[PDB]
């Protein structure tokens, strides 16, 4: 009912339990993306060495984002707006909601809370590529409408949040919504029957999704670096490549969408 | 979606189908039997051999309600869109199979939350010509007659995992006795085909005890050996079944699967 506030000193303090549930939750993940999240997620776990047994405060990440890429983590106590949301991205702040879910809740609860942004977000801010078009990204939606908007949270949704990689080595992960929970790590992996499609941002943009659901498809980068070939495009490119998306229409609805409320 | 309404009858109880509803209902019943030929069970099949449903035109319920009778002393009823349990557990009670008389717009033809007539008809009414499905849908009614709340999520449960989303584990294989796959491609692809979705040899108190929800693909089935197999419920007394509430009430819902807890 009320997610915290930091004191005077930007301070938070969490129960014991808090940091339990934050320990139960870290050392489950880590078991489960050995060698499943990419090389550049775990590189990025070694430079913010996080605390296994207790929840760490903000500064303690935002001065290993800085050193790294220039970011931080920006404290968020209610759901923030859209534009908020880019603002905050386009300043190289990542919104962080100061709140960890109830021991009923560990499994999954909808909100992201700290663990997930955290754990499954934060590692990747220390990598120049993902931090660069985490950057670009939201300056793509400070001047974008709400429907051009939509198409932008499509390709957050496809990269950010549940991107995969095509490694000589195997498939592996780095989307957030996927590292922070071994439900979607194993179903990212190992789910033989889900859509693994190579990235192409027509496609990608085109791709109705359903948040409440487990993902019928998902888009394949070869390596983080990737990611530079969409930072790289102008504003007006990414428009255009919109605009393009919106002139063929949507895919189809895989059956599960369909079945979605 | 689509707001739905039931059409009004005759006053003989006729319905008059435009054109273009017996077209939609023509390619529904096209496209699904192809689908199942070779994956709705024996007794689904001798179902439809005897209702003999029109394949290009919707059936008057009356069509229905004449072979229903026939064979099991059931009926079709003619009820609106949106009807509560007290209603449908005693229709059922009253060997009264409730059909909503609309069909689906083109544009929701893939898929849509209500039952429409051809979910009803052709997904649900074949088997209630079976002495042992129709006898265990009657049995179904009268367990929710004096239900509370709390009991009828649990017989819900039960009907979910049998007359809606019921696998059978054949001797010729894999087979759907299911209304909720049967009526649907892509329920009965991914019931039949999927490789990871859990199906589960049936069990009263599992089912009884497994958290579910409707708007995702199911993580997991249950499989009778033959629709004969709900003869065993069926037999039940009411305080029986009951009691196997209780016990699931008492001992807890099984730990839901990730698809669930992820859920709306």
Redesign the interface.
């Known amino acids: 009912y009320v997610s915290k506030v930091p004191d005077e000193h930007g301070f938070i303090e969490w129960s014991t339990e808090e940091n339990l549930i934050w320990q139960e939750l870290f050392t489950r993940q880590i078991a489960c993306i050995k060698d499943k999240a990419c090389d550049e997620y775990h590189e990025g776990l070694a430079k913010l060495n996080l605390p296994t047994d207790r929840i760490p405060q903000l500064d303690e990440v935002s001065k290993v984002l800085k050193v790294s890429t220039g970011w931080e983590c920006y404290p968020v106590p209610a759901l923030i707006g859209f534009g908020e949301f880019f603002r905050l991205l386009s300043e190289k702040k990542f919104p962080v909601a100061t709140f960890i879910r109830s021991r009923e809740e560990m499994?999954?609860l909808?909100e992201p809370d700290i663990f997930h942004e955290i754990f499954g977000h934060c590692p990747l801010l220390t990598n120049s590529s993902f931090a660069n078009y985490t950057e670009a990204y939201g300056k793509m939606g400070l001047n974008a409408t709400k429907e051009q908007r939509v198409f932008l949270a499509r390709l957050y949704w496809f990269t950010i949040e549940f991107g995969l990689l095509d490694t000589p080595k195997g498939l592996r992960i780095y989307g957030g919504g996927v590292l922070s929970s071994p439900?979607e790590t194993?179903?990212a992996m190992?789910?033989?029957?889900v859509d693994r499609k190579p990235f192409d941002i027509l496609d990608v943009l085109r791709t109705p999704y359903r948040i409440?659901?487990?993902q019928p498809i998902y888009y394949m980068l070869t390596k983080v670096s990737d990611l530079d070939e969409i930072r790289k495009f102008e504003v007006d490119d990414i428009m255009e490549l919109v605009a393009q998306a919106e002139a063929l229409g949507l895919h189809e609805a895989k059956?599960?969408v369909?079945?979605?409320?």
Do not use: E, L, V
Not at 190 to 193: A, C, E, Q, R, V
């Open positions: 499994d999954y909808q439900g194993d179903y190992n789910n033989t029957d409440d659901i487990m059956f599960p369909k079945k979605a409320s």
